[PDB]
Design a binder for this molecule. Structure first.
Ligand code: HEM
Ligand code: HEM
Ligand code: OLW
Ligand code: OLW
Ligand code: H4B
Ligand code: H4B
Ligand code: ZN
Lengths: 407, 411
């Protein structure tokens, strides 16, 4: 039960002890591996709080202290009285940093302890939510010198007064269904772009329209707000070699900000906790641009490159894929917006694994998600065995609000 | 139980009932997934139910379940087991077994071809010389002057684990690797240890960059013997690029026949420790892994230089750019010489169809996403977007230890 992980390129072996702490289930069994599957009371609450405070207090070298036992009693009483409890600012920050640290699908976790935590638990309205988000966006963007941040809205109570950001990311481009069956803009957001328009939103109906924010506070109906454009940093995409690339008329946004996840800390649930870091190049160039159910531009680019598209054997797609990804990197770098290529990021994740195994006894990791969607085996993470397991505090998926909301 | 898998690019949802027939363990638990872990003398006590399970399958496949022929066969096997401690498969059962082991091989993307497998029965073999002969015939038949045919040669099964037949080579055809005293490496670094063994065993090495290794062959538990495959039986392809003329001057070539020879084949509880099989290459096996892995020939540098790429920063994606051209050259060279090969787009696409068909006809298709997804351009192949369930069915191909670590030397 003391598992080893091997890097097959370096023969480096690491021993994993951290997994023994894990409590939540993987979805796997002894008979079947589900590693490639995308989606996996008062009496419940106190042991959860206890486990968290124990590790919090251990992390600061006061395990078993008076202050430890005291915080424990104090929280125990508040749960017994209120049926919930409130985190101290220090515990909140710790919890958030550790949810990131525990995110087995995030390749950028080497940065985990440098997170800026915005406490938004005093928020009561969607306008208030918008204000906190504009502040997050402006701060995180930092004129292109990106800084990791999370903003944390009030925790769930009854489940009918949830704070929710309806957007999947704070900044995304619209998707419109044409009359000729086609799709203009981002196909992933066709449904959300629909709801925004359903709720008002004058759609410019372009290829790249910044979606409006759709914010839900205390379980009320959601409200539309438009992010000040001067806060949405965007990058025109050109190639350092192909002058015609400019004329594809592509661009992307600089701030990658996940807004639809649920943050769990010491048994408490934060249903609205948008966070942001900075892009790995492939997220945009490989997935956003070249995924078939997304912008799917491969053909158009290969046309422009005059490649033999008559046989898959020519690897025309691969050739275009590389150039596109070159362009993305080049463009962000030229405009001074933070970005990391898949080589640097995976190399840094390897060193991070080394660090975590050394100081924590392990690092949960999802190989299926960690390995970049291009050039897999020429990145070191490919040759790195990884153990996947769920530690708390965590970021979890949660249902889309429009399927759930008592509208 | 019933399990659903979803393709996130097509929304196609498939239902798996087949995983219920799985008996062997995966390595995972409710609390840990070991899906990325590379690697995660039998008594009459356990053997008959293993026999029966296999015989029940086989007779179901031929639509004779519960027949007198089925029942008599069970009876015959049971009697032979308790009298002799083991049993022999009929030719029909062996062929079925070998094909289904391939069919059940969750790490093989080439399984659309599973039913077209040429089975050579080498169970009458007694000596290494005999093994060489069988293996030569296999290579000649499988190669077929470039028009490759999938085949497997099956040597006698294990008895007491002291008389194992083994092919010591990891593949029937592979290049030698030589560690130089300066730390550098000549040839294929993956083969340094094995190359050293052959040399110790008496192989006179030419010490080049592409020396075809000798066969090191073990029959009946005896010490292994060296043989040289007749060079005219080894089809090789010089690698060139369709636009880049300096590419041929890299001096690269590869062999045409990919043949795994170190695995163990299990059928009805019987263990076949020598069972070399061969298909044909997916281009990335060579162009990406063989040529570009840092721990292999590792040509990215030399290629990128000759391409005059900006090699100063990784952000230029010079490595990615070179990798593509190399894989273009490998596919080009094989097609030009009419030697069977398949690109990663074509092969993954066929696998999806195979998979869909297996779910409908068989109730599932065990697959290892980690291995099925090609080592370049992953998400522009449809397998990246396919949820897959991994589980173990028998008959099966299993890993076994390297014979030099276990062999008892007669002297
Ligand atoms: C700062 C640099 C960062 C980099 C380079 C980075 C990189 C990535 C990448 C490439 C993915 C895969 C996303 C996908 O394929 O959909 C990912 C996922 C994820 N990241 Fe990060 N990230 C960063 C910051 C953060 C921060 C600040 C947090 C939280 C505080 C975070 C938490 C997560 C989580 C929970 C996932 C899984 C998302 C999902 O399952 O959909 N990351 N990250
Ligand atoms: C006909 C063309 C075939 C193609 C294109 C193909 C493709 C592949 C590829 C790309 C791999 C991954 C190898 C690696 O990355 O190390 C693989 C693995 C495997 N294949 Fe095939 N294959 C073919 C035929 C066969 C045949 C004839 C058999 C057996 C009768 C077979 C059984 C297996 C097994 C057992 C593995 C796992 C190997 C391991 O774990 O080391 N395949 N296949
Ligand atoms: N549910 C769901 C679900 C399934 C597959 C992918 C998805 C998107 N995952 C996040 C993608 C994304 C976008 C922008 N930014 C970031 N990001 C930023 C820092 N770390 C990740 N991540 C969600
Ligand atoms: N143990 C082990 C282990 C770890 C990584 C790669 C490995 C080789 N896997 C097979 C490679 C290979 C070579 C030639 N041919 C084929 N081949 C033929 C048909 N299907 C695959 N496969 C073994
Ligand atoms: C089916 C498969 O699990 C799915 O396509 C996964 C594969 N790996 C991934 N990896 C990352 N980083 N992001 C993803 O969306 C996915 N999708
Ligand atoms: C650690 C990791 O599982 C290992 O590098 C695997 C990844 N996927 C693979 N996939 C294939 N086809 N072949 C391999 O050798 C590997 N190696
Ligand atoms: Zn698993």
């Amino acid at each position: 039960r003391f598992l080893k992980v091997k890097n097959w390129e370096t023969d480096v072996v690491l021993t994993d002890t951290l997994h023994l702490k894990s409590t939540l289930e993987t979805g796997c069994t002894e008979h079947i591996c589900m590693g490639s599957i995308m989606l996996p009371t008062k009496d419940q609450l106190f042991p959860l709080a206890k486990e968290f405070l124990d590790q919090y207090y251990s992390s600061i070298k006061r395990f078993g202290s008076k202050a430890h036992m005291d915080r424990l009693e104090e929280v125990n009483k508040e749960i017994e009285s209120t049926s919930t409890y409130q985190l101290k600012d220090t515990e909140l920050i710790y919890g958030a940093k550790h949810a990131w640290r525990n995110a087995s699908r995030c390749v950028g976790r080497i940065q985990w302890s440098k997170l800026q935590v915005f406490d938004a638990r005093d928020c009561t309205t969607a306008h208030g939510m918008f204000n906190y988000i504009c502040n997050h966006v402006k701060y995180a963007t930092n004129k292109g010198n990106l800084r990791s941040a999370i903003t944390i809205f009030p925790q769930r109570t009854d489940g009918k007064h949830d704070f929710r950001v309806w957007n999947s990311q704070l900044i995304r481009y619209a998707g419109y269904k044409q009359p000729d069956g086609s799709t203009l803009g981002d196909p992933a957001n066709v449904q959300f772009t629909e709801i925004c328009i359903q709720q008002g939103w004058k759609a410019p109906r372009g290829r790249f329209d910044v979606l409006p924010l759709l914010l839900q506070a205390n379980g009320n109906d959601p409200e539309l707000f438009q992010i000040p454009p001067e806060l949405v940093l965007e990058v025109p995409i050109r190639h350092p070699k192909f002058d015609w690339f400019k004329d594809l008329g592509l661009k992307w946004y600089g701030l990658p900000a996940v807004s639809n996840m649920l943050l769990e800390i010491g048994g408490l649930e934060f249903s609205a906790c948008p966070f942001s870091g900075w892009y790995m190049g492939t997220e945009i160039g490989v997935r956003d641009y070249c995924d078939n159910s997304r912008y799917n531009i491969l053909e158009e680019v290969a046309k422009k490159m005059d490649l033999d598209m008559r046989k898959t054997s020519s690897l025309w797609k691969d050739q275009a894929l590389v150039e596109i990804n070159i362009a993305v990197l080049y463009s962000f770098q030229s405009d001074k917006v933070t970005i990391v290529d898949h080589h640097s990021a995976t190399e840094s994740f390897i060193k991070h694994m080394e660090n975590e195994y050394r100081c924590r006894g392990g690092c949960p990791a999802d190989w299926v998600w960690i390995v970049p969607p291009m050039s897999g085996s020429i990145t070191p993470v490919f040759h790195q065995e990884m153990l996947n397991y769920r530690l708390t505090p965590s970021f979890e998926y949660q249902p889309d609000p429009w399927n759930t909301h008592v509208w």
